[PDB]
Write an enzyme that holds these catalytic residues in place. Structure first.
Site, PDB file in Angstrom:
ATOM      1  N   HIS A  40       0.937  -1.298  -0.176  1.00 52.33           N
ATOM      2  CA  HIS A  40      -0.088   0.033  -0.021  1.00 52.33           C
ATOM      3  C   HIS A  40       0.703   1.301   0.107  1.00 52.33           C
ATOM      4  O   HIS A  40       2.047   1.228   0.218  1.00 52.33           O
ATOM      5  CB  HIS A  40      -0.969   0.098   1.239  1.00 52.33           C
ATOM      6  CG  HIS A  40      -0.497   0.353   2.235  1.00 52.33           C
ATOM      7  ND1 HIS A  40      -1.271   1.267   3.339  1.00 52.33           N
ATOM      8  CD2 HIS A  40       0.711   0.184   2.988  1.00 52.33           C
ATOM      9  CE1 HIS A  40      -0.502   1.574   4.336  1.00 52.33           C
ATOM     10  NE2 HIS A  40       0.691   0.961   4.372  1.00 52.33           N
ATOM     11  N   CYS A  94       3.343   5.526   5.627  1.00 52.72           N
ATOM     12  CA  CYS A  94       3.554   4.263   6.533  1.00 52.72           C
ATOM     13  C   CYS A  94       4.810   3.782   6.508  1.00 52.72           C
ATOM     14  O   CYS A  94       5.803   3.994   5.516  1.00 52.72           O
ATOM     15  CB  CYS A  94       2.636   3.053   5.730  1.00 52.72           C
ATOM     16  SG  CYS A  94       3.151   1.534   6.752  1.00 52.72           S
ATOM     17  N   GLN A 112      -7.625  -2.795   9.300  1.00 52.80           N
ATOM     18  CA  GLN A 112      -8.624  -1.780   9.584  1.00 52.80           C
ATOM     19  C   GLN A 112      -9.621  -2.245   8.455  1.00 52.80           C
ATOM     20  O   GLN A 112      -9.319  -2.792   7.389  1.00 52.80           O
ATOM     21  CB  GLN A 112      -8.081  -0.431   9.339  1.00 52.80           C
ATOM     22  CG  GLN A 112      -7.454   0.095  10.550  1.00 52.80           C
ATOM     23  CD  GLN A 112      -6.779   1.551  10.381  1.00 52.80           C
ATOM     24  OE1 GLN A 112      -7.346   2.503  10.936  1.00 52.80           O
ATOM     25  NE2 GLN A 112      -5.968   1.683   9.458  1.00 52.80           N
ATOM     26  N   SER A 135      -6.262   5.650   9.496  1.00 52.53           N
ATOM     27  CA  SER A 135      -4.893   6.087   9.240  1.00 52.53           C
ATOM     28  C   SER A 135      -4.696   7.334   8.225  1.00 52.53           C
ATOM     29  O   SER A 135      -3.856   7.888   8.273  1.00 52.53           O
ATOM     30  CB  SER A 135      -4.127   4.994   8.787  1.00 52.53           C
ATOM     31  OG  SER A 135      -4.291   3.686   9.594  1.00 52.53           O
ATOM     32  N   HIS A 138      -5.543   5.314   1.328  1.00 57.72           N
ATOM     33  CA  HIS A 138      -4.562   4.175   0.932  1.00 57.72           C
ATOM     34  C   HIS A 138      -4.768   3.889  -0.498  1.00 57.72           C
ATOM     35  O   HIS A 138      -5.949   4.045  -1.135  1.00 57.72           O
ATOM     36  CB  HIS A 138      -4.828   2.932   1.554  1.00 57.72           C
ATOM     37  CG  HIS A 138      -4.837   3.005   2.915  1.00 57.72           C
ATOM     38  ND1 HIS A 138      -3.893   2.498   3.789  1.00 57.72           N
ATOM     39  CD2 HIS A 138      -5.591   3.329   3.884  1.00 57.72           C
ATOM     40  CE1 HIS A 138      -3.958   2.571   5.353  1.00 57.72           C
ATOM     41  NE2 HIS A 138      -5.191   3.184   5.377  1.00 57.72           N
TER      42      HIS A 138
END
Ligand SMILES: CN(CCO)c1ccccn1
Ligand SMILES: CN(CCO)c1ccccn1
EC number: 5.2.1.8
Length: 144
Positions: A40, A94, A112, A135, A138
């Protein structure tokens, strides 16, 4: 149609296309395991659960600005101007950026939920559109 897919109509061209409401993918062509492997690219914003990353101690960009960044990366990946792995290594918020975005293999019940659902609805080799979690936003690439 495969899980999550619907017909839609292009507003600019009027040609039929296909959209997946679980992965947010879209394409012109007419389109479960215990584990999947995904990479990702994450773009954080000011409302992320932790608005900080290895790129930036204080992430200040708005959600709207993060979505524009995601959209631009999707454009360059689909045009072949840039590779997913290259953009992930350079611009993902990330820590998996150091591994070209690779998260390894995982089962249901680990990630998630919106991320998990998109990952398992992708076909091997397929990539998502923007997927929203706590977060951030993505781009997901299913590798296995
Ligand atoms: C409020 N707006 C802009 C208006 O469409 C956002 C917010 C988040 C993502 C995209 N657009
Ligand atoms: C999969 N993760 C952790 C997720 O944040 C990796 C992978 C390589 C380097 C650092 N973190």
């Amino acid at each position: 149609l495969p899980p999550g897919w619907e017909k839609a109509m292009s507003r600019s061209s009027g040609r039929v296309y296909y959209f997946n409401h679980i992965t947010n993918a879209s394409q012109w062509e007419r389109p479960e395991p215990a584990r999947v492997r995904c990479s990702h690219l994450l773009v954080k914003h000011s409302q992320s659960r932790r608005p900080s990353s290895w790129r930036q101690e204080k992430i200040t960009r708005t959600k709207e600005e993060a979505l524009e960044l995601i959209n631009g990366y999707i454009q360059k990946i689909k045009s072949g101007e840039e590779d997913f792995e290259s953009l992930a290594s350079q611009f993902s918020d990330c820590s998996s950026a150091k591994a070209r975005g690779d998260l390894g293999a995982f089962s249901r019940g680990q990630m998630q939920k919106p991320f998990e659902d998109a990952s398992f609805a992708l076909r091997t080799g397929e990539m998502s559109g923007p997927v929203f979690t706590d977060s951030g936003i993505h781009i997901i690439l299913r590798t296995e």
